[PDB]
Amino acid sequence: SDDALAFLSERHLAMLTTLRADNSPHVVAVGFTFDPKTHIARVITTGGSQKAVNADRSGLAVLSQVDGARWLSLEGRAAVNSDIDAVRDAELRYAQRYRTPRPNPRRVVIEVQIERVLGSADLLD
Amino acid sequence: SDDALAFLSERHLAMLTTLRADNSPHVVAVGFTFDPKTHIARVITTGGSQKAVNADRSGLAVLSQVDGARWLSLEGRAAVNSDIDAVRDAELRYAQRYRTPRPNPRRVVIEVQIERVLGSADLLD
Ligand code: NA
Ligand code: NA
């Protein structure tokens, strides 16, 4: 829905859930971006972070955002992309929502192909 | 830390992460309470909810709260308690942070024994 898309444009952090090797959830705050056309969500991080290692190793992620009583969780399949062009593009998408990220040659992108969306009733449909 | 305890008293929702049978994370917004003395976090829900089924079946949960740049994730071992006295007590703890919950004879409590805390640097130590 359009209210959902506006919510996803607001400047807030979200929680990224990935799985550790033992299947325990690792849940940490991140910024993210969401492309409504492709359904790809992106998190930028430094290579080798626990987020990146978990996303690469287990292949899934959830991004969960809440403000007041409004919330969404976006679930999907995750991979890590270290291609320089992909990283630049993700940095610019990030800047579009947040602000210009600090330069970091070690930056990688966690790309999540969203399959399922849960959320508050005011944001679904 | 004391700033962490104050953060955990503020009236905000949080995300509860549990695992589905297939190990995919189920992440939905909840209110919760946290007892600093016992390290028990509590979520009230209607019996048979996906949260309750996942907590009972897989035995783990994470509660994650974010406001602005401040955040905490509380990880631990989860169980479902349907004892009437436990439910009343959890309802009152909930009311202490939020407001009196609607009467519901089917209410159960997800009790999470917190083992690990992650968060923003301003809240740890
Ligand atoms: Na960091
Ligand atoms: Na509900």
Curated annotation (Swiss-Prot), chains A, B:
Q: SUPFAM superfamilies annotated for this entry?
A: FMN-binding split barrel (SSF50475)
Summarize where coenzyme F420-(gamma-Glu)n binds, as residue positions. 26-31, 44-45, 50-51, 57, 68-71
Reactions mediated catalytically: (4Z,15Z)-bilirubin IXalpha + oxidized coenzyme F420-(gamma-L-Glu)(n) + H(+) = biliverdin IXalpha + reduced coenzyme F420-(gamma-L-Glu)(n)
The Enzyme Commission number assigned here is 1.3.98.-
Keyword check for Oxidoreductase, yes or no: yes
Q: How does it assemble?
A: Homodimer.
Which protein family is it in?
Belongs to the F420H(2)-dependent biliverdin reductase family.
Kindly give the NCBIfam families that the UniProt entry links to this protein. Answer: Rv1155_F420 (TIGR03618)
Q: What is this protein called?
A: F420H(2)-dependent biliverdin reductase
**Could you tell me which species this protein originates from?**
Mycobacterium tuberculosis (strain CDC 1551 / Oshkosh)
